[PDB]
Amino acid sequence: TDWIPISQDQRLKKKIITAGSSDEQPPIGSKVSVHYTGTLTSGKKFDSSLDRGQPFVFTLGKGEVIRGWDLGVKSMKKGEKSYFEIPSDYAYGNNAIPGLIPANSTLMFEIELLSWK
């Protein structure tokens, strides 16, 4: 698709790669399971759960992941695979994550919402 804005300022946005298996979206408090691939805006991959083969699990809306993931995954339907542009103020801000993410990074993510409970 073309870019779909998620945040009010439209700077957090996604393109749907694969439409979901249903129209269901996860409520806050859901323990969601996702597969993801993270890249810098150069296209350089820094992390992927597919390399490990284990989905990543977090509780939606708790603020225990970056804001762009809480907002972005809330926008997803069950089974959806989408591509997100996540500005630094929706990610790690001015922080570096040593060995992973340079300071002040826009992050790109492919995220597949596998399931939740």
PDB file of all heavy atoms in Angstrom, residues 55-87, unseen atoms left out:
ATOM      1  N   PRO A  55       9.276 -15.934  17.993  1.00  0.00           N
ATOM      2  CA  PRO A  55       8.557 -14.658  18.039  1.00  0.00           C
ATOM      3  C   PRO A  55       8.840 -13.917  19.334  1.00  0.00           C
ATOM      4  O   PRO A  55       9.176 -14.512  20.361  1.00  0.00           O
ATOM      5  CB  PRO A  55       7.083 -15.066  17.942  1.00  0.00           C
ATOM      6  CG  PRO A  55       7.056 -16.523  18.291  1.00  0.00           C
ATOM      7  CD  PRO A  55       8.366 -17.084  17.846  1.00  0.00           C
ATOM      8  N   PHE A  56       8.707 -12.599  19.268  1.00  0.00           N
ATOM      9  CA  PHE A  56       8.842 -11.747  20.436  1.00  0.00           C
ATOM     10  C   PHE A  56       7.466 -11.480  21.035  1.00  0.00           C
ATOM     11  O   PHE A  56       6.502 -11.210  20.315  1.00  0.00           O
ATOM     12  CB  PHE A  56       9.530 -10.432  20.063  1.00  0.00           C
ATOM     13  CG  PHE A  56       9.667  -9.495  21.211  1.00  0.00           C
ATOM     14  CD1 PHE A  56      10.649  -9.692  22.169  1.00  0.00           C
ATOM     15  CD2 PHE A  56       8.797  -8.433  21.358  1.00  0.00           C
ATOM     16  CE1 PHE A  56      10.761  -8.841  23.246  1.00  0.00           C
ATOM     17  CE2 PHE A  56       8.901  -7.573  22.444  1.00  0.00           C
ATOM     18  CZ  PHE A  56       9.891  -7.781  23.385  1.00  0.00           C
ATOM     19  N   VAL A  57       7.373 -11.570  22.361  1.00  0.00           N
ATOM     20  CA  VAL A  57       6.109 -11.436  23.072  1.00  0.00           C
ATOM     21  C   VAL A  57       6.189 -10.222  23.983  1.00  0.00           C
ATOM     22  O   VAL A  57       7.183 -10.035  24.695  1.00  0.00           O
ATOM     23  CB  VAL A  57       5.782 -12.702  23.883  1.00  0.00           C
ATOM     24  CG1 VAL A  57       4.515 -12.498  24.713  1.00  0.00           C
ATOM     25  CG2 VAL A  57       5.623 -13.888  22.952  1.00  0.00           C
ATOM     26  N   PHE A  58       5.148  -9.399  23.957  1.00  0.00           N
ATOM     27  CA  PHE A  58       5.068  -8.301  24.903  1.00  0.00           C
ATOM     28  C   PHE A  58       3.602  -8.013  25.188  1.00  0.00           C
ATOM     29  O   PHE A  58       2.709  -8.470  24.470  1.00  0.00           O
ATOM     30  CB  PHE A  58       5.812  -7.052  24.405  1.00  0.00           C
ATOM     31  CG  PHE A  58       5.175  -6.367  23.216  1.00  0.00           C
ATOM     32  CD1 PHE A  58       4.336  -5.270  23.403  1.00  0.00           C
ATOM     33  CD2 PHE A  58       5.459  -6.781  21.919  1.00  0.00           C
ATOM     34  CE1 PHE A  58       3.781  -4.608  22.309  1.00  0.00           C
ATOM     35  CE2 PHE A  58       4.904  -6.132  20.814  1.00  0.00           C
ATOM     36  CZ  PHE A  58       4.063  -5.041  21.014  1.00  0.00           C
ATOM     37  N   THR A  59       3.364  -7.269  26.266  1.00  0.00           N
ATOM     38  CA  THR A  59       2.010  -6.907  26.663  1.00  0.00           C
ATOM     39  C   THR A  59       1.667  -5.552  26.060  1.00  0.00           C
ATOM     40  O   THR A  59       2.336  -4.550  26.339  1.00  0.00           O
ATOM     41  CB  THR A  59       1.864  -6.877  28.182  1.00  0.00           C
ATOM     42  OG1 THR A  59       2.172  -8.171  28.717  1.00  0.00           O
ATOM     43  CG2 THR A  59       0.433  -6.513  28.562  1.00  0.00           C
ATOM     44  N   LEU A  60       0.627  -5.528  25.239  1.00  0.00           N
ATOM     45  CA  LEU A  60       0.321  -4.349  24.444  1.00  0.00           C
ATOM     46  C   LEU A  60      -0.197  -3.220  25.325  1.00  0.00           C
ATOM     47  O   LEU A  60      -1.063  -3.430  26.178  1.00  0.00           O
ATOM     48  CB  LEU A  60      -0.704  -4.713  23.380  1.00  0.00           C
ATOM     49  CG  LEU A  60      -1.092  -3.646  22.382  1.00  0.00           C
ATOM     50  CD1 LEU A  60       0.142  -3.282  21.567  1.00  0.00           C
ATOM     51  CD2 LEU A  60      -2.166  -4.212  21.501  1.00  0.00           C
ATOM     52  N   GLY A  61       0.339  -2.014  25.113  1.00  0.00           N
ATOM     53  CA  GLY A  61      -0.133  -0.836  25.816  1.00  0.00           C
ATOM     54  C   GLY A  61       0.471  -0.618  27.182  1.00  0.00           C
ATOM     55  O   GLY A  61       0.071   0.329  27.875  1.00  0.00           O
ATOM     56  N   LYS A  62       1.414  -1.456  27.600  1.00  0.00           N
ATOM     57  CA  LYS A  62       2.062  -1.295  28.893  1.00  0.00           C
ATOM     58  C   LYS A  62       3.228  -0.315  28.847  1.00  0.00           C
ATOM     59  O   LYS A  62       3.742   0.068  29.905  1.00  0.00           O
ATOM     60  CB  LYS A  62       2.549  -2.653  29.406  1.00  0.00           C
ATOM     61  N   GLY A  63       3.640   0.112  27.655  1.00  0.00           N
ATOM     62  CA  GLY A  63       4.819   0.943  27.538  1.00  0.00           C
ATOM     63  C   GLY A  63       6.115   0.210  27.791  1.00  0.00           C
ATOM     64  O   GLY A  63       7.106   0.843  28.166  1.00  0.00           O
ATOM     65  N   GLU A  64       6.136  -1.115  27.606  1.00  0.00           N
ATOM     66  CA  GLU A  64       7.348  -1.895  27.817  1.00  0.00           C
ATOM     67  C   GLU A  64       8.119  -2.123  26.529  1.00  0.00           C
ATOM     68  O   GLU A  64       9.159  -2.784  26.551  1.00  0.00           O
ATOM     69  CB  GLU A  64       7.023  -3.238  28.487  1.00  0.00           C
ATOM     70  CG  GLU A  64       6.335  -4.260  27.612  1.00  0.00           C
ATOM     71  CD  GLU A  64       6.174  -5.596  28.324  1.00  0.00           C
ATOM     72  OE1 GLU A  64       6.703  -5.748  29.448  1.00  0.00           O
ATOM     73  OE2 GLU A  64       5.517  -6.495  27.766  1.00  0.00           O
ATOM     74  N   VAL A  65       7.627  -1.587  25.419  1.00  0.00           N
ATOM     75  CA  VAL A  65       8.330  -1.528  24.152  1.00  0.00           C
ATOM     76  C   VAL A  65       8.295  -0.081  23.686  1.00  0.00           C
ATOM     77  O   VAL A  65       7.647   0.768  24.297  1.00  0.00           O
ATOM     78  CB  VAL A  65       7.710  -2.457  23.088  1.00  0.00           C
ATOM     79  CG1 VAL A  65       7.864  -3.923  23.491  1.00  0.00           C
ATOM     80  CG2 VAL A  65       6.247  -2.090  22.867  1.00  0.00           C
ATOM     81  N   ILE A  66       8.977   0.194  22.574  1.00  0.00           N
ATOM     82  CA  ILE A  66       8.981   1.560  22.066  1.00  0.00           C
ATOM     83  C   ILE A  66       7.566   1.981  21.686  1.00  0.00           C
ATOM     84  O   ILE A  66       6.718   1.154  21.316  1.00  0.00           O
ATOM     85  CB  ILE A  66       9.945   1.725  20.877  1.00  0.00           C
ATOM     86  CG1 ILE A  66       9.616   0.754  19.741  1.00  0.00           C
ATOM     87  CG2 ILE A  66      11.390   1.573  21.357  1.00  0.00           C
ATOM     88  CD1 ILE A  66      10.489   0.960  18.504  1.00  0.00           C
ATOM     89  N   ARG A  67       7.313   3.292  21.786  1.00  0.00           N
ATOM     90  CA  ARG A  67       5.965   3.810  21.559  1.00  0.00           C
ATOM     91  C   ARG A  67       5.454   3.453  20.169  1.00  0.00           C
ATOM     92  O   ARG A  67       4.264   3.159  19.990  1.00  0.00           O
ATOM     93  CB  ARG A  67       5.955   5.324  21.764  1.00  0.00           C
ATOM     94  CG  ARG A  67       4.574   5.940  21.684  1.00  0.00           C
ATOM     95  CD  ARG A  67       4.572   7.313  22.332  1.00  0.00           C
ATOM     96  NE  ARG A  67       5.468   8.251  21.660  1.00  0.00           N
ATOM     97  CZ  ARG A  67       5.054   9.243  20.879  1.00  0.00           C
ATOM     98  NH1 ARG A  67       3.757   9.423  20.672  1.00  0.00           N
ATOM     99  NH2 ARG A  67       5.933  10.056  20.306  1.00  0.00           N
ATOM    100  N   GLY A  68       6.335   3.480  19.166  1.00  0.00           N
ATOM    101  CA  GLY A  68       5.910   3.132  17.821  1.00  0.00           C
ATOM    102  C   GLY A  68       5.416   1.704  17.700  1.00  0.00           C
ATOM    103  O   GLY A  68       4.570   1.410  16.851  1.00  0.00           O
ATOM    104  N   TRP A  69       5.933   0.798  18.536  1.00  0.00           N
ATOM    105  CA  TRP A  69       5.407  -0.563  18.547  1.00  0.00           C
ATOM    106  C   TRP A  69       4.066  -0.655  19.274  1.00  0.00           C
ATOM    107  O   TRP A  69       3.157  -1.345  18.799  1.00  0.00           O
ATOM    108  CB  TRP A  69       6.407  -1.517  19.196  1.00  0.00           C
ATOM    109  CG  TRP A  69       7.456  -2.060  18.280  1.00  0.00           C
ATOM    110  CD1 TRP A  69       7.980  -1.472  17.154  1.00  0.00           C
ATOM    111  CD2 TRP A  69       8.111  -3.311  18.420  1.00  0.00           C
ATOM    112  NE1 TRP A  69       8.929  -2.300  16.597  1.00  0.00           N
ATOM    113  CE2 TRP A  69       9.028  -3.434  17.358  1.00  0.00           C
ATOM    114  CE3 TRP A  69       8.011  -4.356  19.353  1.00  0.00           C
ATOM    115  CZ2 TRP A  69       9.836  -4.560  17.201  1.00  0.00           C
ATOM    116  CZ3 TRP A  69       8.822  -5.459  19.204  1.00  0.00           C
ATOM    117  CH2 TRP A  69       9.723  -5.554  18.130  1.00  0.00           C
ATOM    118  N   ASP A  70       3.918   0.007  20.427  1.00  0.00           N
ATOM    119  CA  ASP A  70       2.618  -0.003  21.093  1.00  0.00           C
ATOM    120  C   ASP A  70       1.546   0.577  20.173  1.00  0.00           C
ATOM    121  O   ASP A  70       0.475  -0.011  19.996  1.00  0.00           O
ATOM    122  CB  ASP A  70       2.684   0.786  22.404  1.00  0.00           C
ATOM    123  CG  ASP A  70       2.858  -0.100  23.639  1.00  0.00           C
ATOM    124  OD1 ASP A  70       2.715  -1.340  23.563  1.00  0.00           O
ATOM    125  OD2 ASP A  70       3.144   0.475  24.711  1.00  0.00           O
ATOM    126  N   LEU A  71       1.824   1.729  19.558  1.00  0.00           N
ATOM    127  CA  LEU A  71       0.832   2.326  18.666  1.00  0.00           C
ATOM    128  C   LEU A  71       0.692   1.524  17.384  1.00  0.00           C
ATOM    129  O   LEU A  71      -0.420   1.338  16.871  1.00  0.00           O
ATOM    130  CB  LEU A  71       1.219   3.764  18.329  1.00  0.00           C
ATOM    131  CG  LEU A  71       1.183   4.799  19.444  1.00  0.00           C
ATOM    132  CD1 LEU A  71       1.699   6.137  18.938  1.00  0.00           C
ATOM    133  CD2 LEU A  71      -0.237   4.930  19.982  1.00  0.00           C
ATOM    134  N   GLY A  72       1.810   1.048  16.844  1.00  0.00           N
ATOM    135  CA  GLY A  72       1.765   0.380  15.554  1.00  0.00           C
ATOM    136  C   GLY A  72       1.077  -0.967  15.622  1.00  0.00           C
ATOM    137  O   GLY A  72       0.246  -1.295  14.771  1.00  0.00           O
ATOM    138  N   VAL A  73       1.413  -1.771  16.637  1.00  0.00           N
ATOM    139  CA  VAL A  73       0.788  -3.089  16.746  1.00  0.00           C
ATOM    140  C   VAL A  73      -0.695  -2.963  17.092  1.00  0.00           C
ATOM    141  O   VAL A  73      -1.515  -3.744  16.597  1.00  0.00           O
ATOM    142  CB  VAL A  73       1.560  -3.954  17.761  1.00  0.00           C
ATOM    143  CG1 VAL A  73       0.870  -5.292  17.960  1.00  0.00           C
ATOM    144  CG2 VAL A  73       2.991  -4.180  17.258  1.00  0.00           C
ATOM    145  N   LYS A  74      -1.075  -1.956  17.884  1.00  0.00           N
ATOM    146  CA  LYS A  74      -2.496  -1.727  18.144  1.00  0.00           C
ATOM    147  C   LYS A  74      -3.278  -1.517  16.848  1.00  0.00           C
ATOM    148  O   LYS A  74      -4.454  -1.893  16.769  1.00  0.00           O
ATOM    149  CB  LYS A  74      -2.665  -0.526  19.074  1.00  0.00           C
ATOM    150  N   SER A  75      -2.641  -0.934  15.820  1.00  0.00           N
ATOM    151  CA  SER A  75      -3.291  -0.665  14.540  1.00  0.00           C
ATOM    152  C   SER A  75      -3.424  -1.899  13.665  1.00  0.00           C
ATOM    153  O   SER A  75      -4.099  -1.830  12.628  1.00  0.00           O
ATOM    154  CB  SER A  75      -2.524   0.407  13.758  1.00  0.00           C
ATOM    155  OG  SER A  75      -1.409  -0.140  13.062  1.00  0.00           O
ATOM    156  N   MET A  76      -2.810  -3.013  14.045  1.00  0.00           N
ATOM    157  CA  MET A  76      -2.716  -4.175  13.173  1.00  0.00           C
ATOM    158  C   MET A  76      -3.857  -5.151  13.410  1.00  0.00           C
ATOM    159  O   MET A  76      -4.359  -5.301  14.525  1.00  0.00           O
ATOM    160  CB  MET A  76      -1.384  -4.888  13.382  1.00  0.00           C
ATOM    161  CG  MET A  76      -0.182  -4.043  12.954  1.00  0.00           C
ATOM    162  SD  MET A  76       1.371  -4.877  13.278  1.00  0.00           S
ATOM    163  CE  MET A  76       1.372  -6.158  12.017  1.00  0.00           C
ATOM    164  N   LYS A  77      -4.261  -5.815  12.336  1.00  0.00           N
ATOM    165  CA  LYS A  77      -5.194  -6.925  12.422  1.00  0.00           C
ATOM    166  C   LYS A  77      -4.440  -8.232  12.648  1.00  0.00           C
ATOM    167  O   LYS A  77      -3.248  -8.353  12.353  1.00  0.00           O
ATOM    168  CB  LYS A  77      -6.032  -7.013  11.151  1.00  0.00           C
ATOM    169  CG  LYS A  77      -6.901  -5.782  10.908  1.00  0.00           C
ATOM    170  CD  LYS A  77      -7.597  -5.872   9.565  1.00  0.00           C
ATOM    171  CE  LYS A  77      -8.421  -4.625   9.260  1.00  0.00           C
ATOM    172  NZ  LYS A  77      -9.151  -4.768   7.965  1.00  0.00           N
ATOM    173  N   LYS A  78      -5.156  -9.219  13.187  1.00  0.00           N
ATOM    174  CA  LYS A  78      -4.563 -10.535  13.398  1.00  0.00           C
ATOM    175  C   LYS A  78      -3.966 -11.056  12.096  1.00  0.00           C
ATOM    176  O   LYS A  78      -4.630 -11.059  11.056  1.00  0.00           O
ATOM    177  CB  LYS A  78      -5.617 -11.503  13.925  1.00  0.00           C
ATOM    178  CG  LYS A  78      -5.057 -12.842  14.373  1.00  0.00           C
ATOM    179  CD  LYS A  78      -6.143 -13.728  14.991  1.00  0.00           C
ATOM    180  CE  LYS A  78      -6.655 -13.096  16.280  1.00  0.00           C
ATOM    181  NZ  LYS A  78      -7.622 -13.988  16.994  1.00  0.00           N
ATOM    182  N   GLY A  79      -2.704 -11.483  12.150  1.00  0.00           N
ATOM    183  CA  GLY A  79      -2.032 -12.004  10.966  1.00  0.00           C
ATOM    184  C   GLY A  79      -1.456 -10.965  10.021  1.00  0.00           C
ATOM    185  O   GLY A  79      -0.750 -11.339   9.069  1.00  0.00           O
ATOM    186  N   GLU A  80      -1.721  -9.680  10.244  1.00  0.00           N
ATOM    187  CA  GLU A  80      -1.216  -8.639   9.357  1.00  0.00           C
ATOM    188  C   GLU A  80       0.305  -8.606   9.373  1.00  0.00           C
ATOM    189  O   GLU A  80       0.937  -8.802  10.412  1.00  0.00           O
ATOM    190  CB  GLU A  80      -1.791  -7.290   9.790  1.00  0.00           C
ATOM    191  CG  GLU A  80      -1.294  -6.082   9.001  1.00  0.00           C
ATOM    192  CD  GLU A  80      -1.980  -4.819   9.462  1.00  0.00           C
ATOM    193  OE1 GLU A  80      -3.215  -4.860   9.665  1.00  0.00           O
ATOM    194  OE2 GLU A  80      -1.274  -3.799   9.636  1.00  0.00           O
ATOM    195  N   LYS A  81       0.901  -8.394   8.202  1.00  0.00           N
ATOM    196  CA  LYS A  81       2.316  -8.057   8.106  1.00  0.00           C
ATOM    197  C   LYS A  81       2.399  -6.656   7.521  1.00  0.00           C
ATOM    198  O   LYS A  81       1.839  -6.401   6.452  1.00  0.00           O
ATOM    199  CB  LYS A  81       3.085  -9.057   7.240  1.00  0.00           C
ATOM    200  CG  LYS A  81       4.595  -8.788   7.221  1.00  0.00           C
ATOM    201  CD  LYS A  81       5.351  -9.919   6.516  1.00  0.00           C
ATOM    202  CE  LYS A  81       6.832  -9.603   6.405  1.00  0.00           C
ATOM    203  NZ  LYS A  81       7.568 -10.653   5.640  1.00  0.00           N
ATOM    204  N   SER A  82       3.067  -5.754   8.233  1.00  0.00           N
ATOM    205  CA  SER A  82       3.152  -4.365   7.810  1.00  0.00           C
ATOM    206  C   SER A  82       4.565  -3.847   7.992  1.00  0.00           C
ATOM    207  O   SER A  82       5.377  -4.414   8.727  1.00  0.00           O
ATOM    208  CB  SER A  82       2.160  -3.487   8.572  1.00  0.00           C
ATOM    209  OG  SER A  82       0.854  -3.756   8.074  1.00  0.00           O
ATOM    210  N   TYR A  83       4.849  -2.767   7.271  1.00  0.00           N
ATOM    211  CA  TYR A  83       6.154  -2.119   7.255  1.00  0.00           C
ATOM    212  C   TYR A  83       6.004  -0.737   7.867  1.00  0.00           C
ATOM    213  O   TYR A  83       5.184   0.058   7.403  1.00  0.00           O
ATOM    214  CB  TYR A  83       6.659  -2.031   5.817  1.00  0.00           C
ATOM    215  CG  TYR A  83       8.043  -1.471   5.630  1.00  0.00           C
ATOM    216  CD1 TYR A  83       9.152  -2.077   6.217  1.00  0.00           C
ATOM    217  CD2 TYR A  83       8.253  -0.364   4.823  1.00  0.00           C
ATOM    218  CE1 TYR A  83      10.427  -1.581   6.006  1.00  0.00           C
ATOM    219  CE2 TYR A  83       9.518   0.140   4.619  1.00  0.00           C
ATOM    220  CZ  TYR A  83      10.600  -0.472   5.212  1.00  0.00           C
ATOM    221  OH  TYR A  83      11.863   0.030   4.989  1.00  0.00           O
ATOM    222  N   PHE A  84       6.772  -0.466   8.916  1.00  0.00           N
ATOM    223  CA  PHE A  84       6.628   0.747   9.708  1.00  0.00           C
ATOM    224  C   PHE A  84       7.855   1.632   9.586  1.00  0.00           C
ATOM    225  O   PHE A  84       8.989   1.156   9.676  1.00  0.00           O
ATOM    226  CB  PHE A  84       6.426   0.413  11.191  1.00  0.00           C
ATOM    227  CG  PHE A  84       5.136  -0.284  11.497  1.00  0.00           C
ATOM    228  CD1 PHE A  84       5.013  -1.657  11.320  1.00  0.00           C
ATOM    229  CD2 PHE A  84       4.055   0.424  11.995  1.00  0.00           C
ATOM    230  CE1 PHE A  84       3.814  -2.313  11.639  1.00  0.00           C
ATOM    231  CE2 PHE A  84       2.855  -0.233  12.302  1.00  0.00           C
ATOM    232  CZ  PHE A  84       2.743  -1.594  12.125  1.00  0.00           C
ATOM    233  N   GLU A  85       7.621   2.931   9.413  1.00  0.00           N
ATOM    234  CA  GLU A  85       8.641   3.945   9.632  1.00  0.00           C
ATOM    235  C   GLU A  85       8.418   4.547  11.010  1.00  0.00           C
ATOM    236  O   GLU A  85       7.346   5.108  11.276  1.00  0.00           O
ATOM    237  CB  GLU A  85       8.579   5.023   8.559  1.00  0.00           C
ATOM    238  CG  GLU A  85       9.676   6.052   8.717  1.00  0.00           C
ATOM    239  CD  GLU A  85       9.870   6.900   7.475  1.00  0.00           C
ATOM    240  OE1 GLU A  85      10.124   6.334   6.389  1.00  0.00           O
ATOM    241  OE2 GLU A  85       9.722   8.131   7.585  1.00  0.00           O
ATOM    242  N   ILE A  86       9.422   4.453  11.873  1.00  0.00           N
ATOM    243  CA  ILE A  86       9.293   4.841  13.269  1.00  0.00           C
ATOM    244  C   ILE A  86      10.331   5.915  13.572  1.00  0.00           C
ATOM    245  O   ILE A  86      11.496   5.611  13.826  1.00  0.00           O
ATOM    246  CB  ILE A  86       9.458   3.629  14.200  1.00  0.00           C
ATOM    247  CG1 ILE A  86       8.446   2.545  13.816  1.00  0.00           C
ATOM    248  CG2 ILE A  86       9.236   4.040  15.647  1.00  0.00           C
ATOM    249  CD1 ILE A  86       8.307   1.416  14.846  1.00  0.00           C
ATOM    250  N   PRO A  87       9.930   7.189  13.591  1.00  0.00           N
ATOM    251  CA  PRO A  87      10.860   8.259  13.966  1.00  0.00           C
ATOM    252  C   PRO A  87      11.452   8.037  15.350  1.00  0.00           C
ATOM    253  O   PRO A  87      10.900   7.325  16.195  1.00  0.00           O
ATOM    254  CB  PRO A  87       9.985   9.524  13.929  1.00  0.00           C
ATOM    255  CG  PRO A  87       8.824   9.156  13.030  1.00  0.00           C
ATOM    256  CD  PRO A  87       8.580   7.705  13.293  1.00  0.00           C
TER     257      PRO A  87
END
